[PDB]
Amino acid sequence: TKETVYISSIALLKMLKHGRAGVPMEVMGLMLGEFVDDYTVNVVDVFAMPQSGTGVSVEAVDDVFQAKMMDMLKQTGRDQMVVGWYHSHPGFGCWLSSVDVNTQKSFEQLNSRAVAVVVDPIQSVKGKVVIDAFRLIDTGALINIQALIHGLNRHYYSLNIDYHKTAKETKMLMNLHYEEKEESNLAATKSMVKIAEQYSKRIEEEKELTEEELKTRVGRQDPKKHLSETADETLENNIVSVLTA
Amino acid sequence: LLEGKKVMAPYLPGSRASSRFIKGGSLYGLGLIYAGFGRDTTDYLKNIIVENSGTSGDEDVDVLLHGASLGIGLAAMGSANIEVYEALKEVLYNDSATSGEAAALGMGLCMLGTGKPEAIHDMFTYSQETQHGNITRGLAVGLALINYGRQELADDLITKMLASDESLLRYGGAFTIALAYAGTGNNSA
Amino acid sequence: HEKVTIAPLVLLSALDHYERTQTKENKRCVGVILGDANSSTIRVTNSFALPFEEDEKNSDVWFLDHNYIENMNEMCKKINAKEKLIGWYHSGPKLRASDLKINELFKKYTQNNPLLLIVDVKQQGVGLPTDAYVAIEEKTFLHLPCTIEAEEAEEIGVEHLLRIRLTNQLKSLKGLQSKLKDVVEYLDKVIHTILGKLQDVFNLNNLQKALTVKTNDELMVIYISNLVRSIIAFDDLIENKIQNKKIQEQRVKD
């Protein structure tokens, strides 16, 4: 019931990339990973099904290309379990499709269990992520139990996602931002070009405050607030330039 | 100190149960009474463990293993028997998130104390080595277990645990530092 | 010239490839890289491990098939048309002339002269664990600088990772360190032209002029905010406890 999903952020972003552009369509395709003992949903990989001009369906799944890949992937050494289903569900918290369920449901057959990964690629882009994976049924549970034996299990029923990568790509990630020296000091020592503004910016701060202080004579805009946050933003940015000179 | 066994007797293995896990519960549930005093039954169970140790990935067994793998170090706690550690070590190494988890504990329970660094290595090794959340996790405990009162001792592993990217080592490190420094405050710690 | 985007998504799996392939320094895990190569900026969408064999016991000796790419691109196409082959990667971290041969294979498969990609599978030093090359001529090949795009989709899951100035200094040595040596290297390596090519820009220093005063003059105002920077502090937190304690220290009724 508390179940451990694990993603290759690669596969994550791979999907995202595929999913981000996938709008409108729910993106479709494999989900490469495994289950380490229980709870454990591993993902090394995933991939697009190629566009479905029939849209997402239990049908639109083609296992040809997977094998093709999977071979070339096997050739790549790339091999996993297909662990479930991940699609791009514009403005969808909700649930994907009972179809998608049935789609998966047909498929989680092929596993002990699978997922259908909810993604709103819209709501994903927010700088935080929007996502879920359903697989709606249990063994018992973390062992949930009753509605299955009582039949009629339907719901959202998420799984519990996680993922892992490494400190390795983390670097290569945080490598984002020769280099620094070329990248940094010296690369943005450009200031003085704006000294006028840099003045004027600082200049403008002044006025805002006589104003602000004045009200001292209720709630925010308060006479002693934006003052610092204002005259404090031009203080530093104006000191960093000194490093160059 | 008697009946509890007889209490578990109906739910002991070989008296079957409804569930293997019910059947497993006695195993652990046993030493609850007998902690320190049931080592024999424990070792007996350990034998049953040892019996199923190197095999039988049945969840039923796993639990049966696990529930035993629970009750083993339970009584064996504070009792240093490599076997306890050992028999689990592979039960551990058998990598049943079910079973090997309890192993990650009982083994510690065995060597809970200064324990041995080699387990520590291996634990710490297995930790990173063994692939599971919890199996990896509970190892931290056994570390913390077999790092107990040691204080300055485990600091390296602590540091190593500290050095863990993962919680789990860092995680246990705290407990380790606890079982090391628990009670008396080491301010720095 | 066409200097290029970088797909982290690539970068990641790329090492997985290296990882998956268990490639070692003996080896370089090689593969396609994907994007669209037209513009004076090229993009890396993606990239694909080319199941491969490398032997430097005999340089030119190594094994690869294209026909991956063949079936690959199909699916890639079927996946996306925009895959269009920009080039390829390998592990690296460094070149081996057989690369050149290997490079030219893709020339058949690419629009422009295709794109090499080095990776530092150990990501060791610095910005990029990576180089991308295009052949040339007296052969030429070259690194055009490259970098990441958005891929905020990336950047978001990215965000789930991590978690002011002195650095900026720190590289100060670095190039200089090598640099002088790099002469003394090539000096006493060949004891080329590009070094003198550097030599000129050197005087681009002691360059400073009473324009310096401007700085001083400038720095002044920078500080003017000082009395203001903490003025609000000067005024703000001091007269704040006098209204809460007098209220309170005296509150103290019954």
XYZ file of C-alpha atoms in Angstrom:
688
model
C 0.000 0.000 0.000
C 2.940 2.279 0.736
C 4.761 1.218 -2.382
C 8.123 2.384 -3.615
C 8.301 3.672 -7.157
C 11.738 4.498 -8.533
C 12.411 6.471 -11.630
C 15.325 7.181 -13.805
C 14.991 10.926 -14.024
C 16.288 10.313 -17.523
C 13.156 8.311 -18.208
C 11.322 10.938 -16.211
C 12.601 13.801 -18.308
C 12.541 11.608 -21.391
C 8.828 11.236 -20.792
C 8.571 14.918 -19.861
C 10.331 15.977 -23.029
C 8.124 13.526 -24.894
C 5.223 14.574 -22.680
C 5.903 18.317 -22.675
C 5.762 18.288 -26.448
C 3.134 15.530 -26.361
C 0.367 18.027 -25.671
C -2.315 17.373 -26.602
C -1.764 13.630 -26.557
C -1.072 11.528 -23.582
C 2.350 10.221 -24.439
C 2.566 6.488 -24.489
C 4.999 3.704 -24.347
C 7.099 1.377 -22.328
C 8.202 1.816 -18.736
C 11.527 0.111 -18.143
C 12.381 -1.007 -14.660
C 11.586 -3.878 -12.327
C 10.307 -4.779 -8.878
C 12.928 -5.414 -6.223
C 11.144 -7.659 -3.777
C 7.859 -5.893 -3.165
C 6.966 -2.235 -3.099
C 9.813 -1.576 -5.420
C 9.010 0.011 -8.723
C 12.270 0.601 -10.483
C 12.572 2.657 -13.618
C 15.667 2.723 -15.705
C 13.762 3.733 -18.747
C 10.582 4.202 -20.714
C 9.952 5.491 -24.155
C 7.506 7.013 -26.563
C 5.304 4.968 -28.370
C 5.526 6.726 -31.706
C 2.627 9.080 -32.318
C -0.742 7.429 -32.140
C -2.953 8.970 -34.757
C -5.393 6.655 -33.046
C -4.437 8.304 -29.751
C -3.702 6.513 -26.502
C -5.256 3.098 -26.471
C -4.764 -0.425 -25.320
C -4.637 -0.783 -29.100
C -2.203 1.970 -30.043
C 0.455 0.069 -28.131
C 2.854 -1.489 -30.631
C 5.251 -3.968 -29.148
C 7.095 -4.172 -32.444
C 9.170 -1.089 -31.946
C 9.913 -1.849 -28.333
C 11.438 -5.167 -29.343
C 13.217 -3.343 -32.146
C 14.577 -0.996 -29.566
C 14.582 -3.686 -26.905
C 16.783 -5.656 -29.254
C 18.871 -2.610 -30.076
C 18.412 -1.946 -26.378
C 19.443 -5.482 -25.605
C 22.117 -4.609 -28.130
C 22.628 -1.446 -26.101
C 22.607 -3.716 -23.075
C 19.470 -1.826 -22.353
C 17.034 -4.179 -20.754
C 14.376 -3.927 -18.074
C 10.891 -4.998 -17.202
C 8.141 -3.013 -18.765
C 6.742 -1.720 -15.517
C 3.716 0.186 -16.514
C 2.158 3.168 -18.163
C 2.891 6.869 -18.320
C 0.923 9.434 -20.266
C 0.432 13.149 -20.573
C -2.909 14.220 -19.230
C -3.446 17.905 -19.912
C -5.072 19.569 -16.929
C -5.805 16.170 -15.366
C -5.438 15.375 -11.712
C -8.508 13.194 -11.750
C -7.542 9.904 -13.347
C -6.433 8.971 -16.809
C -8.864 6.590 -18.366
C -10.616 3.532 -17.123
C -9.523 2.754 -20.658
C -5.993 3.691 -19.635
C -6.713 1.559 -16.593
C -8.125 -1.200 -18.785
C -5.255 -0.436 -21.122
C -2.850 -0.872 -18.230
C -5.179 -3.415 -16.722
C -4.713 -5.517 -19.806
C -0.999 -4.924 -19.325
C -0.221 -5.001 -15.616
C -1.336 -8.506 -16.450
C 2.010 -8.829 -18.162
C 3.599 -7.960 -14.852
C 2.976 -8.752 -11.275
C 1.724 -5.208 -11.418
C 2.270 -2.043 -13.381
C 1.554 1.651 -13.311
C -0.295 4.154 -15.357
C 1.640 7.354 -14.820
C -0.478 10.438 -14.655
C 1.233 13.476 -16.078
C -0.145 16.811 -16.689
C 2.569 18.138 -18.979
C 0.768 21.446 -18.644
C 0.853 21.415 -14.883
C 4.233 19.719 -14.974
C 5.955 22.761 -16.446
C 5.223 24.793 -13.331
C 8.743 24.413 -12.008
C 7.336 21.775 -9.715
C 6.076 18.469 -11.102
C 2.563 17.176 -11.625
C 2.292 13.407 -11.857
C 0.904 10.143 -10.473
C 0.822 6.438 -11.157
C -2.287 4.347 -10.642
C -2.476 0.660 -10.469
C -5.882 0.065 -9.041
C -6.032 -3.192 -7.084
C -3.823 -4.708 -4.316
C -2.654 -8.120 -3.210
C -4.348 -7.483 -0.007
C -2.674 -4.240 0.628
C 0.559 -3.380 2.189
C -1.159 -6.528 3.601
C -6.762 -2.403 -0.217
C -8.013 -5.785 0.934
C -11.779 -5.670 1.217
C -13.142 -3.976 -1.896
C -11.178 -6.424 -4.032
C -12.714 -9.522 -2.448
C -15.919 -7.539 -2.240
C -15.287 -6.813 -5.915
C -15.847 -3.436 -7.570
C -12.444 -1.820 -7.032
C -12.377 1.524 -8.867
C -10.845 4.813 -7.827
C -7.977 6.994 -8.665
C -5.727 4.788 -6.491
C -2.289 6.268 -6.940
C 0.882 4.449 -6.172
C 3.667 6.120 -4.151
C 6.306 7.490 -6.479
C 9.981 7.990 -5.954
C 13.131 7.864 -8.060
C 16.856 7.952 -7.641
C 19.778 8.928 -9.672
C 23.182 9.620 -8.236
C 25.509 12.299 -7.161
C 27.103 11.547 -10.509
C 24.670 13.204 -12.894
C 23.915 15.545 -10.016
C 27.221 17.219 -10.757
C 26.556 16.909 -14.462
C 23.166 18.320 -13.604
C 24.406 21.063 -11.314
C 26.991 21.607 -14.014
C 24.066 23.645 -15.378
C 24.453 26.915 -13.572
C 38.221 27.876 -18.929
C 34.740 28.118 -17.405
C 34.215 30.231 -14.295
C 37.118 32.547 -14.967
C 35.638 32.833 -18.407
C 32.168 32.364 -16.923
C 32.024 34.536 -13.903
C 33.805 37.545 -12.568
C 34.462 38.750 -15.470
C 31.407 37.656 -17.315
C 28.978 40.025 -15.526
C 31.622 42.473 -14.410
C 29.444 44.498 -16.709
C 27.998 47.000 -14.294
C 29.397 50.428 -14.916
C 27.585 50.456 -18.203
C 24.551 50.908 -15.970
C 26.115 53.075 -13.244
C 23.589 55.721 -14.188
C 20.804 53.253 -13.564
C 22.895 51.762 -10.810
C 22.796 55.270 -9.475
C 19.296 55.977 -10.679
C 18.082 52.653 -9.335
C 19.699 53.593 -6.037
C 18.506 57.133 -6.654
C 14.962 56.026 -6.986
C 15.138 54.059 -3.772
C 15.407 57.322 -1.848
C 12.042 58.794 -2.793
C 10.114 55.609 -2.129
C 10.972 55.864 1.489
C 10.395 59.413 2.658
C 7.032 58.254 1.397
C 7.198 55.022 3.297
C 8.618 56.481 6.527
C 5.977 59.168 6.380
C 2.941 56.955 6.994
C 4.357 56.450 10.485
C 2.085 59.336 11.187
C -3.270 49.688 9.763
C -1.360 47.146 7.657
C 1.485 46.718 5.179
C 3.174 49.082 2.745
C 4.397 49.956 6.262
C 6.583 53.057 6.822
C 9.600 50.938 7.736
C 9.451 47.925 5.419
C 10.280 48.128 1.712
C 12.881 50.632 2.910
C 15.621 48.070 3.544
C 14.453 45.482 1.012
C 14.822 48.397 -1.405
C 18.019 50.139 -0.302
C 19.441 46.694 0.465
C 19.088 45.300 -3.057
C 21.263 48.024 -4.580
C 23.840 47.746 -1.797
C 25.247 44.311 -2.632
C 24.902 44.239 -6.419
C 26.929 47.445 -6.142
C 29.679 45.863 -4.043
C 30.262 42.806 -6.231
C 31.500 45.107 -8.994
C 34.289 46.240 -6.669
C 35.769 42.747 -6.947
C 36.632 43.449 -10.584
C 38.332 46.778 -9.879
C 8.397 -18.314 30.529
C 6.652 -21.504 29.477
C 3.101 -20.946 28.362
C 4.000 -18.252 25.880
C 5.699 -20.938 23.856
C 2.711 -23.191 24.409
C 0.660 -20.086 23.664
C 2.444 -19.829 20.346
C 2.361 -23.617 20.026
C -0.971 -23.644 18.127
C 0.346 -20.828 15.979
C 3.851 -22.163 15.919
C 4.990 -23.583 12.601
C 4.082 -27.239 12.330
C 0.888 -26.425 14.167
C 0.286 -24.525 10.940
C -2.018 -21.485 11.174
C -4.506 -19.782 8.931
C -1.674 -17.686 7.456
C 1.962 -18.577 7.070
C 2.445 -15.106 8.405
C 0.154 -15.820 11.283
C 2.316 -18.904 11.400
C 5.201 -16.458 11.130
C 3.949 -14.226 13.914
C 4.586 -16.761 16.666
C 8.186 -17.007 15.527
C 8.820 -13.414 16.342
C 6.021 -13.257 18.872
C 7.802 -15.957 20.825
C 10.930 -14.275 22.146
C 8.819 -11.328 23.255
C 8.509 -13.298 26.433
C 11.792 -15.093 26.078
C 14.097 -12.257 25.075
C 17.479 -13.452 26.237
C 15.854 -16.645 27.519
C 14.596 -18.221 24.296
C 17.934 -18.406 22.524
C 17.555 -22.135 22.160
C 14.116 -21.947 20.583
C 15.545 -18.918 18.841
C 18.520 -20.930 17.620
C 16.031 -23.693 17.039
C 14.061 -21.167 15.032
C 17.396 -20.033 13.645
C 17.861 -23.623 12.610
C 14.440 -23.365 10.987
C 15.760 -20.105 9.645
C 19.033 -21.806 8.762
C 16.795 -24.511 7.353
C 15.047 -22.097 5.048
C 17.893 -19.578 5.143
C 19.660 -20.298 1.901
C 16.491 -20.827 -0.086
C 12.720 -20.581 -0.220
C 11.866 -17.115 -1.447
C 8.242 -17.836 -0.596
C 6.722 -14.773 1.014
C 5.108 -17.319 3.264
C 8.566 -18.677 3.906
C 9.945 -15.167 3.766
C 7.604 -14.156 6.553
C 8.178 -17.522 8.152
C 11.811 -16.703 7.685
C 11.170 -13.065 8.568
C 8.917 -13.650 11.559
C 11.585 -16.038 12.723
C 14.205 -13.628 11.420
C 12.421 -11.279 13.762
C 12.216 -13.416 16.862
C 15.770 -14.656 16.432
C 17.770 -11.561 17.307
C 14.905 -10.725 19.636
C 16.054 -13.226 22.227
C 19.515 -13.238 20.673
C 19.685 -9.513 21.353
C 22.693 -8.686 23.462
C 23.647 -12.272 22.885
C 26.561 -12.328 20.513
C 26.232 -15.322 18.258
C 27.808 -14.927 14.881
C 25.275 -17.504 13.693
C 22.450 -15.174 14.618
C 24.269 -12.499 12.692
C 25.607 -15.045 10.227
C 22.554 -17.191 9.551
C 20.715 -13.936 9.026
C 23.684 -12.517 7.134
C 22.714 -14.598 4.154
C 19.037 -14.478 5.066
C 19.933 -10.846 4.937
C 21.949 -11.525 1.852
C 18.996 -13.534 0.514
C 17.601 -10.048 0.026
C 14.015 -10.580 1.034
C 12.789 -7.118 1.895
C 10.456 -9.181 3.995
C 13.046 -11.391 5.626
C 16.456 -9.791 5.242
C 15.013 -6.776 6.953
C 14.689 -8.492 10.312
C 18.166 -9.858 9.645
C 19.394 -6.262 9.381
C 18.165 -6.062 12.933
C 18.705 -9.366 14.692
C 22.268 -9.411 13.429
C 22.717 -6.083 15.103
C 20.785 -7.422 18.077
C 23.317 -10.225 18.256
C 26.302 -7.918 18.124
C 24.447 -4.947 19.587
C 27.305 -3.619 21.518
C 30.621 -2.815 19.989
C 29.724 -5.604 17.607
C 32.208 -6.270 14.956
C 33.489 -3.842 12.340
C 33.438 -6.552 9.720
C 29.707 -6.847 9.953
C 29.842 -3.076 10.027
C 31.844 -3.149 6.818
C 29.537 -5.730 5.390
C 26.451 -4.068 6.810
C 27.699 -0.769 5.483
C 28.825 -2.741 2.473
C 25.545 -4.590 2.104
C 23.812 -1.312 2.786
C 25.180 0.312 -0.308
C 25.689 -3.125 -1.807
C 22.350 -4.794 -1.158
C 19.596 -3.416 -3.317
C 16.399 -2.646 -1.385
C 15.208 0.317 0.558
C 14.569 -1.348 3.842
C 17.109 -4.126 3.681
C 19.591 -1.373 3.027
C 17.861 0.700 5.691
C 17.602 -1.599 8.661
C 21.288 -2.305 8.295
C 21.844 1.177 9.648
C 20.093 -0.011 12.777
C 22.269 -3.071 13.203
C 25.196 -0.748 12.709
C 23.717 1.504 15.359
C 23.033 -1.677 17.270
C 26.501 -3.058 17.049
C 27.666 0.481 17.443
C 26.507 0.989 20.967
C 28.183 3.022 23.645
C 31.115 2.868 21.279
C 30.864 6.600 20.923
C 34.145 7.761 19.447
C 34.405 4.347 17.837
C 31.710 4.367 15.157
C 32.445 8.010 14.307
C 34.182 6.866 11.163
C 31.248 4.779 10.071
C 29.204 7.592 11.521
C 31.229 9.870 9.292
C 30.741 7.256 6.601
C 27.083 7.193 7.526
C 27.258 10.964 7.665
C 29.026 10.760 4.325
C 26.118 8.765 2.963
C 24.382 10.408 0.136
C 21.511 8.375 1.487
C 19.506 8.959 4.568
C 19.845 5.402 5.616
C 23.456 5.561 6.691
C 23.260 9.148 7.876
C 19.922 8.037 9.240
C 21.339 5.261 11.374
C 24.388 7.334 12.163
C 22.179 9.386 14.400
C 20.955 6.240 16.086
C 24.510 5.018 15.899
C 25.668 8.196 17.585
C 22.775 7.634 19.939
C 23.603 4.018 20.780
C 27.137 5.306 20.914
C 26.362 8.441 22.903
C 22.826 7.760 24.086
C 22.219 8.755 27.628
C 25.212 10.981 28.259
C 25.286 14.007 26.016
C 28.216 14.364 23.728
C 27.556 17.965 22.878
C 29.646 17.805 19.745
C 27.988 14.562 18.694
C 29.457 28.449 -36.262
C 26.605 26.047 -35.557
C 27.535 25.677 -31.874
C 25.165 23.512 -30.145
C 22.564 22.866 -27.490
C 23.099 20.090 -24.980
C 20.406 17.730 -23.763
C 21.026 16.694 -20.159
C 18.604 13.870 -20.870
C 21.339 12.691 -23.205
C 24.086 13.408 -20.740
C 22.394 11.289 -18.104
C 21.574 8.190 -20.138
C 24.874 8.674 -21.881
C 26.571 7.753 -18.675
C 23.984 5.084 -18.079
C 25.150 3.756 -21.398
C 28.687 4.027 -20.103
C 27.278 2.512 -16.921
C 25.067 -0.004 -18.684
C 27.916 -0.847 -21.018
C 30.218 -0.931 -17.993
C 32.543 0.918 -20.296
C 35.888 1.640 -18.723
C 38.870 3.805 -19.559
C 39.878 1.045 -21.940
C 36.614 1.823 -23.703
C 34.303 4.616 -24.714
C 30.577 4.021 -24.824
C 29.510 5.474 -28.123
C 26.285 6.503 -29.574
C 24.028 8.629 -31.709
C 23.144 12.136 -30.694
C 19.942 13.694 -31.835
C 18.433 17.053 -32.438
C 18.306 19.167 -35.553
C 21.619 20.471 -36.873
C 20.752 23.266 -39.314
C 21.088 26.489 -37.410
C 24.206 28.340 -36.338
C 22.992 26.896 -33.103
C 22.398 23.178 -33.185
C 20.190 21.414 -30.718
C 20.693 18.125 -28.965
C 17.342 16.518 -28.421
C 18.526 13.030 -27.685
C 21.158 10.411 -28.346
C 21.434 6.655 -28.521
C 23.993 4.134 -27.395
C 25.415 2.463 -30.446
C 26.270 -1.076 -29.414
C 29.866 -1.010 -30.316
C 33.332 -2.396 -29.913
C 36.519 -0.432 -29.429
C 40.068 -1.676 -29.632
C 43.029 0.584 -29.201
C 45.427 -2.337 -29.058
C 44.980 -1.651 -32.737
C 43.692 1.895 -33.159
C 41.581 1.519 -36.275
C 40.361 -1.789 -34.906
C 36.916 -1.443 -33.339
C 33.421 -2.656 -34.096
C 30.118 -0.918 -34.692
C 26.938 -1.243 -36.704
C 24.996 1.610 -38.202
C 21.893 -0.458 -38.729
C 20.846 0.304 -35.211
C 20.493 3.876 -36.351
C 18.717 2.567 -39.407
C 15.986 0.896 -37.390
C 16.559 3.506 -34.721
C 15.866 6.595 -36.784
C 12.745 4.915 -38.131
C 11.336 4.658 -34.656
C 13.046 7.940 -33.838
C 11.267 9.440 -36.808
C 8.143 7.555 -35.845
C 8.796 8.933 -32.393
C 9.714 12.351 -33.772
C 10.701 13.812 -37.092
C 12.822 16.398 -35.290
C 15.271 13.677 -34.313
C 17.164 14.506 -37.448
C 20.675 13.312 -37.021
C 22.930 15.976 -35.628
C 25.848 13.783 -34.869
C 26.854 11.245 -32.309
C 28.495 10.735 -28.973
C 30.998 8.474 -27.357
C 32.298 8.301 -23.842
C 35.735 9.757 -24.125
C 36.848 11.711 -22.087
C 39.201 12.089 -25.020
C 39.609 11.531 -28.730
C 41.328 8.734 -30.551
C 42.099 9.285 -34.204
C 39.911 6.320 -35.211
C 37.210 8.735 -34.159
C 37.934 10.433 -37.442
C 37.066 7.265 -39.332
C 34.065 6.789 -37.063
C 33.184 10.444 -37.551
C 32.924 9.931 -41.279
C 30.507 7.050 -40.975
C 27.932 9.500 -39.668
C 28.791 11.893 -42.475
C 26.761 9.545 -44.593
C 24.105 9.719 -41.915
C 24.114 13.411 -41.091
C 23.236 16.604 -42.896
C 26.301 18.652 -42.075
C 29.545 17.142 -41.092
C 28.072 15.338 -38.100
C 28.786 16.088 -34.490
C 31.149 14.175 -32.285
C 30.443 14.149 -28.592
C 32.978 13.568 -25.852
C 31.733 12.927 -22.349
C 33.684 12.805 -19.127
C 32.132 9.676 -17.720
C 33.756 10.674 -14.477
C 32.578 14.270 -14.988
C 35.826 15.090 -13.318
C 36.970 18.662 -13.524
C 34.600 21.361 -14.500
C 31.950 22.923 -16.690
C 30.887 20.183 -19.048
C 32.059 16.697 -18.624
C 31.849 17.050 -22.314
C 33.223 18.022 -25.693
C 31.471 18.030 -29.025
C 33.548 17.970 -32.173
C 33.110 18.351 -35.859
C 35.894 17.057 -38.086
C 37.946 19.429 -40.239
C 41.314 19.959 -41.927
C 46.319 18.888 -42.141
C 42.960 17.613 -40.899
C 40.731 19.749 -38.747
C 38.251 18.904 -36.059
C 36.954 21.405 -33.594
C 35.056 22.091 -30.400
C 32.414 24.643 -30.672
C 31.201 25.495 -27.184
C 27.822 24.138 -26.252
C 25.357 24.206 -23.376
C 21.953 23.217 -22.028
C 18.472 24.406 -23.026
C 15.016 24.410 -21.444
C 14.033 21.622 -20.947
C 12.442 23.264 -17.943
C 10.649 19.951 -18.010
C 14.145 18.745 -17.330
C 14.853 21.748 -15.134
C 11.950 20.858 -12.874
C 12.858 17.321 -11.939
C 16.270 18.944 -12.019
C 14.948 21.330 -9.393
C 14.375 18.314 -7.191
C 18.145 18.106 -7.162
C 20.677 20.389 -5.357
C 19.081 20.857 -1.947
C 27.860 34.259 -3.336
C 31.163 35.549 -4.612
C 34.361 33.873 -3.462
C 33.998 31.065 -5.971
C 33.942 33.655 -8.670
C 37.483 34.483 -7.743
C 38.587 30.973 -7.386
C 39.283 29.993 -10.928
C 41.648 32.964 -10.949
C 44.691 30.744 -11.010
C 43.381 27.937 -13.025
C 43.998 28.703 -16.662
C 47.075 30.730 -15.754
C 48.480 27.688 -14.035
C 48.340 25.451 -17.049
C 48.777 28.420 -19.338
C 52.370 29.336 -18.616
C 53.133 25.644 -18.343
C 51.129 25.024 -21.514
C 53.742 27.101 -23.230
C 56.511 25.375 -21.320
C 54.627 22.227 -22.209
C 54.484 22.924 -25.925
C 57.747 24.799 -25.506
C 59.382 21.720 -24.096
C 56.837 19.398 -25.631
C 58.146 20.523 -28.981
C 61.294 21.305 -27.088
C 52.308 25.901 -32.326
C 50.986 28.968 -34.043
C 47.983 29.194 -31.752
C 50.193 30.057 -28.815
C 51.378 33.268 -30.420
C 47.756 33.662 -31.461
C 47.172 33.848 -27.754
C 50.271 35.934 -27.143
C 48.793 39.035 -28.736
C 45.628 39.279 -26.700
C 47.825 39.116 -23.631
C 48.207 42.861 -23.463
C 44.444 42.845 -23.447
C 46.494 43.967 -16.895
C 48.431 47.025 -16.004
C 46.016 48.643 -18.497
C 44.402 50.763 -15.782
C 43.923 54.513 -16.155
C 42.788 57.390 -13.927
C 39.498 56.192 -15.312
C 40.229 54.338 -12.109
C 38.991 57.470 -10.376
C 35.585 56.850 -11.930
C 35.587 53.621 -10.012
C 36.461 55.453 -6.856
C 33.945 58.101 -7.774
C 31.449 55.382 -8.545
C 32.191 53.376 -5.425
C 31.332 56.435 -3.392
C 27.629 56.484 -4.097
C 27.617 52.710 -3.813
C 28.375 53.396 -0.257
C 25.987 56.266 0.096
C 23.243 53.689 0.557
C 25.332 52.529 3.514
C 23.829 54.983 5.998
C 20.597 53.837 4.358
C 21.394 50.132 4.111
C 21.485 49.844 7.880
C 19.812 53.181 8.571
C 16.557 51.317 8.501
C 18.212 48.845 10.789
C 19.644 51.803 12.662
C 16.059 52.945 13.217
C 13.864 49.863 12.834
C 14.747 47.064 15.254
C 16.029 49.423 17.949
C 12.774 51.335 18.417
C 10.902 48.049 18.021
C 11.752 46.408 21.345
C 11.042 49.643 23.215
C 7.371 49.388 22.254
C 7.043 45.676 23.016
C 8.950 45.551 26.298
C 7.574 48.739 27.828
C 4.218 47.255 26.923
C 5.389 43.983 28.345
C 8.039 44.352 31.058
C 5.494 46.715 32.540
C 2.509 44.641 31.415
C 2.656 42.923 34.716
C -0.656 44.074 36.180
C -2.044 41.477 38.571
